[PDB]
Amino acid sequence: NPFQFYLTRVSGVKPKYNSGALHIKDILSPLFGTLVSSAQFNYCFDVDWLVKQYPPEFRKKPILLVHGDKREAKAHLHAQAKPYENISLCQAKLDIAFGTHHTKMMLLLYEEGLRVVIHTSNLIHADWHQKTQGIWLSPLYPRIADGTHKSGESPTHFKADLISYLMAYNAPSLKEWIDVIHKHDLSETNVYLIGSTPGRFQGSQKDNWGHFRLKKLLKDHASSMPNAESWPVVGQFSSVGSLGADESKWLCSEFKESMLTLGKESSSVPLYLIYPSVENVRTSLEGYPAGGSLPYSIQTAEKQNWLHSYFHKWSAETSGRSNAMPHIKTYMRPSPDFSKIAWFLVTSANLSKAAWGALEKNGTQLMIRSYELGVLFLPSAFGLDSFKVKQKFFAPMATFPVPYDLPPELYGSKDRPWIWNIPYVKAPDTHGNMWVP
Ligand SMILES: O=C(O)c1ccc(Nc2c(-c3ccc(CCOCc4ccc(-c5ccccn5)cc4)cc3)nc3cc(-c4ccccc4)ccn23)cc1C(=O)O
16 A cells, blocks of 8 residues: 555454554554654643653653643643653644644654654543544655755655644744754655644635645646536544534535535535444443543534534444544545545544634635644545545555445434533443443
8 A cells, every 4th residue: 555544553343453553652663763852743642651652762762742732731731741851842822712732743753764643643542542543654754865955845745835834833842843854855755734723814825724725735636527516525523613503604615615626627515424423422442431532512513403414423344443433534525436536634623613714804814723734645646536445444555445434324313413511321331331421
């Protein structure tokens, strides 16, 4: 395979379904490189746990934690890291209300080169234990020799785009990492970076971030096909924001419109949204506690019951992970019979305006509240017109490993979306327990 897309290891599936999965301990192993320094971008951290995932010989190498916590939460994180003198922290600025630092990324500097890991897991034990999570592993990027002048740039512009993403933090610890990236050759990179950063973007900057970034890439580097209106859009996520009083206010206006872009030429496109039902969660490996990582509040949901008609159950027989609740987020464009896809995105971005951006000022400005990061797989970046869907995830190799089942299955009439702050007391979970928030 050329895609280097992995799932995390799941405790409690047959070994067949972890062959070619990665634990965090595998990613940080000396076999991946001799670590000199690392940066861990994430949302939440168990620092004691995190240090123990590094090889013992690497545990005193510098670590930078990039987070968005403020006030007492920030103090709690500093207290966590205080026993480790090699740990530094970078507080990502969140100057728009209700924003989050969701981006999950490792920068791994080695004696041998540099690696970038863009993934979906928090740095806590539960996120790597029994959840479905996604990982993109960059190649080992070699250092550009001193005195050599070359860009180190890929046909997907990944090196400049990652530097641009880091530049938006305006942080001195991240300028150091930008200078590291400058000295390495990233030209083998075959994915496109799609980031979100907080701000209000107008003019050309509108295309830099969020769903306008996706739209720009699809217009520039994908082609439309006959019957394109028959190719569905699939979105798959672990958290749901307030989308408005009906589908026209954001979901099916600007968001779907960016998602259905293909090529430069100018809607009945089916939209499938995949989000765990209550029954998905109850019968999962973790039981109801899996719902602690599926944040959808009743206050949000009761204002948009229209949305739940779009919802499809989580099912992942293809990867043996139907009972491993998803914390991965993915978006893709399958063919009408789901046998091919026009592109695939793995990201931190949930189904929210905060993550993807909402148009403001008469459609001229894109406002984004949060930091998000994902990578986009486009057939053109691999010399292809489309990707064939891998029928069994772990089983040619121009075949893309979609980690859950197609077509997605609509909720039944008795199903309900998982809502994390209401009780479930009708039927016990796989550990014998109810859910009482
Ligand atoms: O599904 C996603 O992807 C996603 C969705 C939301 C999100 N964070 C978020 C939350 C929120 C999320 C999770 C919790 C659970 C407690 O903490 C987890 C934790 C903490 C510590 C430890 C620990 C530490 C040391 C040792 C051992 N253990 C372990 C686990 C609590 C809260 N509540 C919000 C609310 C908003 C919001 C609010 C108002 C308006 C608009 C938005 C936004 C984000 N919110 C993070 C993720 C993610 O994974 O990045």
